[PDB]
Design a binder for this molecule. Structure first.
Ligand SMILES: *[C@@H]1O[C@H](CO[C@@H]2O[C@@H](C)[C@@H](O)[C@@H](O)[C@@H]2O)[C@@H](O[C@@H]2O[C@H](CO)[C@@H](O)[C@H](O)[C@H]2NC(C)=O)[C@H](O)[C@H]1NC(C)=O
Ligand SMILES: *[C@@H]1O[C@H](CO[C@@H]2O[C@@H](C)[C@@H](O)[C@@H](O)[C@@H]2O)[C@@H](O[C@@H]2O[C@H](CO)[C@@H](O)[C@H](O)[C@H]2NC(C)=O)[C@H](O)[C@H]1NC(C)=O
Ligand code: NAG
Lengths: 126, 255, 108, 126, 108, 51
């Protein structure tokens, strides 16, 4: 029953850093069965995974969009956040946060995005 | 004679269904043992029920049971009165130790939790001016998860530090999912020391501290022991007592 | 990435299938294929996970299976309400998620 | 005998972030009997508590002025610091740092601001 | 916040009292009332703590007490040098400090 | 990949959390590393968890 909500600038200029924050409510951000994922959908395109927050481990990112991305956490706010450096026109997209489940509650491994926020649309322009 | 008798005219401590840990911590079902007269021996039931109502463990428990053999009477002394803990919540508890439905806790212990949204460093100390060596019990709460840790204590990277002129102990909680015992996936760990006369025990914590309210002053230190038996006291007297009944004889051997 | 038909279509009441093809590395290796339903204006909804299972609250008209390197989403009793983009996602030897291109489902 | 000294910009513009730093000398910033407090006094007004630094715990803030305030620490400098985001005209004040004592040296709890720096006046304007 | 008289006054040599009124939550509950003296241009000086105690170096003309939800600062032998704003502060059920509005003391 | 790691094991009676000790050590059988083993008895009908 956890609610996820994205918030951030709907406009970032070319070559600046885009910073989006997802608030998590109705559940924790800490757990051993989950990763927090950032996913985006450019208009007219499919779903592209950006990267995961591994609260108790190390973060990992899409290898293409790797050198430009940082994912972090604020535990006093129960928020997770995404930063994309050197943004370009190609980075216009609806950005979503999601709860990515890798371990089930039936003593086995699984793999799915269970909860999604509704997303925030970000335009990149000059 | 088939009976459990007073030894040398002094009745045993009959714990009924209580364990030693339940007795000293104040398990709510051991209320009859809150004020205890001098005893000649201890009658502990094998596999007692009223032990640690909040699941957990007790360190050096066998050594404590051994210590209590050569004790007989002791006095319960208030060392750290519950109401000194201002700026903290002293009314926590659990359904595991509930009394008449209502959540409760070990009666000689204070479960300190967050007040408002804060948990100030929990500090206090006691100087043993009671006249004799004192037994002090304290413990550490180990949450089932991080949410529980944050809900009870605002602080997460917590520690509990206790010490005397000889004791130097620092513990941290282990947060982990565990099988449930008595309905809880959490555990509470207890430990104890003896505070030498005229020494001082200090406590300091940023969370997960179960503080003593009382210590136990040793009063007699005579020779005794702990007997395992399901019987009761039968209003008779002896000089030698077995678990099966008392022995009245002048012969050199018995079987 | 995984390959999906760009678009599929069918009439109301018909059963329609949306395929997703990968390699031995993603689909073939693991039984971790999941599917999402995405209506315009909304975040994706999980419909299928672990190849053939449904989340509580998901209609029983949705089902799925896999053979070799091909995963399949089956929608029986096609409704007007099912017009949506559908996506496949799976695990892979490189321990990161993989998404497919996406299929647009048109109900006639 | 600890001395406290505030330092920072005497002017911040509207909607910027104000950042003030308090140096502590003649004593530690670490201890189990204290919190480091930031307090302000707008001209013509009384004393408003902003928030506390709890070195070994979590920080806490005035619930009104909560979402805009961060308090932190630099242990190599033995300094504590305050940041107020989105500053407005209402934030003009003399800002002070203080040693807030919550546990006494007589084995009991207490509650007072024992040491104060002299304060730094910050103007917020357009 | 705690309520204080906006201003009080009296002649040199007289005893003057500055009150501070709160609820059961701050003043009534705890014996943690403290008072500060604040001369213009200087940081506040702690004069009283724990309702009636003084810090070393503080004049014995300052004292205090509480009754119910009301705290009181008493200044005997009022001097010209005592013109200052005075503030009350106390602890509270919500474990944060609470300050009063402040009283200006004018010496005539 | 992770460095500040832990190993947690428990039952209705076992509550153990260990962390690795990274250190240079004399080599034994060619390795400067060490592997530490421990054991428990799992009572009938109980459950052992690993994390
Ligand atoms: C812990 O307390 C002892 C005992 O204090 C005395 O007895 C108490 C019952 C009470 O009446 C106190 O006011 C007494 O002072 C302290 O030991 C005494 O220390 C003084 C000063 O150095 C010395 O003259 C006495 O002979 C000592 N008495 C004994 C029996 O040793 C001890 O210092 C206190 N510990 C701490 C950390 O403060
Ligand atoms: C661990 O398993 C026991 C036993 O489960 C039963 O026996 C297995 C071999 C298998 O056939 C299971 O499907 C059976 O349910 C669980 O204990 C049982 O719990 C039920 C429900 O409360 C109770 O009615 C039975 O009497 C219990 N049986 C025994 C022997 O105690 C136990 O709960 C499981 N532990 C966990 C954490 O799930
Ligand atoms: C033992 O028996 C004698 C009678 O032979 C009796 O007087 C005495 O009281 C009995 N014992 C004890 C241990 O009190």
């Amino acid at each position: 029953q956890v609610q996820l909500q994205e918030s951030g600038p709907g406009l970032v200029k070319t070559s600046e850093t885009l910073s989006l924050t997802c608030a998590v409510s109705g559940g924790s951000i800490s757990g051993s069965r989950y990763y927090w994922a950032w996913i985006r959908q450019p208009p007219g395109k499919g779903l592209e995974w950006i990267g995961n927050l591994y609260y108790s481990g190390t973060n990992f990112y899409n290898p293409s969009l790797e050198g430009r991305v940082t994912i972090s956490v604020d535990t006093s706010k129960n928020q997770v956040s995404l930063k994309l450096s050197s943004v370009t026109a190609a980075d216009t997209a609806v950005y979503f946060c999601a709860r990515h489940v890798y371990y089930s509650d039936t003593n086995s491994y699984t793999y799915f995005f269970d909860y999604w926020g509704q997303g925030t649309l970000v335009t990149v322009s000059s | 004679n088939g009976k459990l008798c007073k030894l040398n005219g002094i009745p045993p401590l009959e714990l009924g269904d209580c364990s030693i840990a339940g007795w000293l911590l104040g398990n709510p079902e051991c209320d009859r043992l809150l004020s205890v007269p001098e005893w000649s021996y201890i009658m502990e039931k094998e596999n007692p029920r009223d032990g640690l109502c909040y699941p957990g463990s007790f360190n050096d428990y066998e050594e404590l049971k051994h210590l209590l053999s050569s004790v007989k009477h002791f006095e319960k002394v208030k060392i750290l009165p519950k109401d000194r803990w201002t700026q903290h919540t002293t009314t926590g508890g659990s359904r595991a130790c509930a009394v008449s439905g209502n959540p409760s806790f070990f009666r000689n212990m204070v479960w300190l939790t967050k007040k408002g949204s804060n948990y100030p460093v929990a500090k206090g100390s006691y100087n043993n001016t009671s006249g004799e060596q004192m037994l002090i019990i304290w413990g550490v709460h180990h949450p089932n998860d991080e949410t529980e840790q944050r809900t009870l204590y605002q602080n997460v990277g917590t520690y509990v530090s206790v010490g005397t002129s000889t004791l130097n102990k620092r513990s941290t909680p282990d947060i982990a999912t565990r099988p449930k015992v008595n309905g809880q996936g959490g555990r509470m760990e207890f430990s104890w020391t003896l505070l030498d006369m005229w020494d001082t025990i200090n406590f300091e914590s940023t969370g997960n501290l179960i503080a003593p309210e009382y210590g136990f002053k040793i009063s007699k230190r005579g020779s005794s022991g702990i007997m395992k038996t399901e019987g009761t006291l039968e209003n008779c007297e002896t000089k030698c007592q077995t678990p099966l009944g008392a022995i009245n004889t002048t012969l050199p051997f018995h079987n | 990435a995984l390959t999906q038909p760009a678009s599929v279509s069918g009439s109301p009441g018909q059963s329609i299938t949306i395929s997703c093809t990968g390699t031995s590395s993603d689909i073939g290796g693991y039984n971790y294929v999941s599917w999402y339903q995405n209506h315009p204006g909304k975040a994706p909804k999980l419909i299928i996970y672990d190849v053939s299972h449904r989340p509580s609250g998901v209609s029983n008209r949705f089902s799925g299976s896999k053979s070799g390197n091909t995963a399949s989403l089956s929608i029986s009793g096609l409704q007007a309400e099912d017009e949506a983009d559908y996506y496949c996602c799976s695990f892979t030897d490189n321990n990161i998620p993989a998404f497919g291109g996406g299929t647009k489902l048109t109900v006639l």
